[PDB]
Design a protein around this nucleic acid. Sequence first.
DNA 1: CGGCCTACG
DNA 2: CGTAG
DNA 3: GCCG
Length: 327
Amino acid sequence: WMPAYACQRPTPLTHHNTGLSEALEILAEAAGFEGSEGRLLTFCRAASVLKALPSPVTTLSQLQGLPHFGEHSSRVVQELLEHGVCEEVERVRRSERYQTMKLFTQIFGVGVKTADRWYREGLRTLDDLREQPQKLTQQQKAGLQHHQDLSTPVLRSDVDALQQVVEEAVGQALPGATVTLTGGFRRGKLQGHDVDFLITHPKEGQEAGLLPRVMCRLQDQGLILYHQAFERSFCIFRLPQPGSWKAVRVDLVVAPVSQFPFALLGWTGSDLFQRELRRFSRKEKGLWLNSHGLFDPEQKTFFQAASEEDIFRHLGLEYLPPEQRNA
DNA sequence: CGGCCTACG
DNA sequence: CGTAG
DNA sequence: GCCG
Ligand SMILES: [Mn+2]
Ligand SMILES: [Mn+2]
Ligand SMILES: [Mn+2]
Ligand SMILES: [Mn+2]
Ligand SMILES: [Mn+2]
Ligand SMILES: [Mn+2]
Ligand SMILES: [Mn+2]
Ligand SMILES: [Mn+2]
Ligand SMILES: [Mn+2]
């Protein structure tokens, strides 16, 4: 019944098994902190299966036959159903290691390997890092400086204001260029950790050199707190608010129009949906997918797509709109 | 046994 | 390494 | 951790 790849099934934003999926996602995050991407992926995939089910799981029997449920994930669910808590999950939650790794990796510019080195050196708080600025890259310094604002959910009103100023700068940089909201907001999320935008021009090649021109125009309007030929810019914007301002993470991506459906698909996510789609493409169809194209390595040709629908069709998949890609 | 997405900055 | 979805 |  339930397909094994997340790209083969609809996953809505609101689902019926949050308690169970949240517990499995804690274990997935902890697996990542200990350097096991494989265990992280299994726990994420198991959590995602539960998000696609039509009803609450109330009895362990309802897991039988589900993909990515084996002995470990099933026992977590059984303990949650039988007792309301999973001892392993609670032990991870309360551990100093998990809490500190979560704190550090949430900083823009810090991943697991950096966080783990700092943990091993005895560092535990954001003030600990601030007291040792020479150990920070420029990106990390920006992430730490703006950490409180970046921990505030981004709202739709923020998205709408940012889209206007990005459209203004893009139109000043290149007439006819377009701006498309991507990321979680395109999947219907009401909040986010950032705003993602994809920029193109209908005439192939006209977008060459665009992103530096857009960045210069935003900087001159005082809108940029942090950035840095390029085609992806992971920015922090100074977003005006009533009487003040707040820092907001914004990702700006430029693609030629030939690549636009592939970039739109990749940048709309979810992260797990796209990893699963790329895995499906290669392992089941023999085709190589990324945000630039879909390559047949035996004919040595790229699939020409005019839409996301075209890509799903070439992969033999039922089309899913963005709001059903919340894997 | 090994794979686990696949790029850019 | 970091970033992205 | 699960699976091809
Ligand atoms: Mn439902
Ligand atoms: Mn186990
Ligand atoms: Mn028990
Ligand atoms: Mn980080
Ligand atoms: Mn986003
Ligand atoms: Mn490129
Ligand atoms: Mn093995
Ligand atoms: Mn993301
Ligand atoms: Mn293992």
